[PDB]
Ligand binder design. Structure first.
Ligand code: 120
Ligand code: NA
Lengths: 11, 36, 250
């Protein structure tokens, strides 16, 4: 359901 | 930060700042025994 | 939001989304009060009954949104939290009294036409706008029905209800740190916040200086848009000293 967000926001 | 907030708070870029009104704010203002 | 419409682009530039990292999901709404502070409902973060107790690391704050599920590249910003402060007397054991929380972001965010803070009210604005009959606005990406999730941010304008009416609609103890709003069964108008909307802002536009002030935070309700029931919100102006203390102490 939610699109993926850029990996640098998980870390 | 201190009380109240930022300084330019509550003035929306795409509306107040360009003197434009969203479609239902009038409803709010009309309920404060009308505001103007 | 039940019986609300699709908001407009940049209508609520202070609307913030609390996003969990794993599973990636919408948790609650929040509001942008300065370049570094976010305001939300404490129950969004800590609610022992249902083992909820999140920390900085489990959340992300998405600002500048409209769409609920898409990453709006070049429009929204994502921040991590530095600190979460819950009201020292938030009561999750009985009625969610003092349901307020502050989050400090890692880094400031730059404002845009889609990201801009809301004002917190002062004794006189509270005094002149928190009157029964006056309408406020609530926004969120929560459910559209009690038992149905929107694609865009939703908005609904509700009236404040007289305290006697709020207290006589529930068995829970109302305190002076909450207020309720909504139409009466007898006002042929509906609307309410619902699941997924907690933490978000209830705002009013001052006719004295045309600024939007946030008077409440979505706290609770029994079901969604049920007749005879109302939505309860945290009373921001009564918890404002607490707010100022943590923002000038930290
Ligand atoms: N009808 C309302 N005015 C309302 C408002 C906030 C709510 N928040 C919740 C809620 C449901 C489940 C988990 N967490 C919540 O905050 N239900 C809610 C209902
Ligand atoms: Na109702």
């Amino acid at each position: 359901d939610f699109e993926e967000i850029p990996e640098e926001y998980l870390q | 930060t201190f009380g109240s907030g930022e300084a330019d708070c509550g003035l929306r870029p795409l509306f107040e700042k360009k003197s434009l009104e969203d479609k239902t704010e009038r409803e709010l203002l009309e309920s404060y025994i009308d505001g103007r | 939001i039940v019986e609300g419409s699709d908001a407009e682009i940049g209508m609520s530039p202070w609307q913030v989304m609390l996003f969990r990292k794993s599973p990636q999901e919408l948790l609650c709404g929040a509001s942008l009060i300065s370049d570094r502070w976010v305001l939300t409902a404490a129950h969004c973060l800590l609610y022992p009954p249902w083992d909820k107790n999140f920390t900085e690391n489990d959340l992300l704050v998405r600002i500048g949104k409209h769409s609920r599920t898409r990453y709006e590249r070049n429009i929204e910003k994502i921040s991590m939290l530095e600190k979460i402060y819950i009201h020292p007397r938030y009561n999750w054991r009985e009625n969610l009294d003092r349901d307020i929380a502050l989050m400090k972001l890692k880094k400031p965010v730059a404002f845009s036409d889609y990201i801009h803070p809301v004002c917190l009210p002062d004794r006189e604005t509270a005094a002149s706008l928190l009157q029964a009959g006056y309408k406020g606005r609530v926004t969120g990406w929560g459910n559209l029905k009690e038992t149905g999730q929107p694609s865009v941010l939703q908005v609904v304008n509700l009236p404040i209800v007289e305290r006697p009416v709020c207290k006589d609609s529930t068995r829970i103890r109302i305190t002076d740190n909450m207020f309720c709003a909504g139409y009466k069964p007898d006002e042929g108008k509906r609307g309410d916040a619902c699941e997924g909307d907690s933490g978000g802002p209830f705002v009013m536009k001052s006719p004295f200086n045309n600024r939007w002030y946030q008077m409440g935070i979505v706290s609770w309700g029994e079901g969604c848009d049920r007749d005879g029931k109302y939505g309860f919100y945290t009373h921001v102006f009564r918890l404002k000293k607490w707010i100022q203390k943590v923002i000038d102490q930290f």
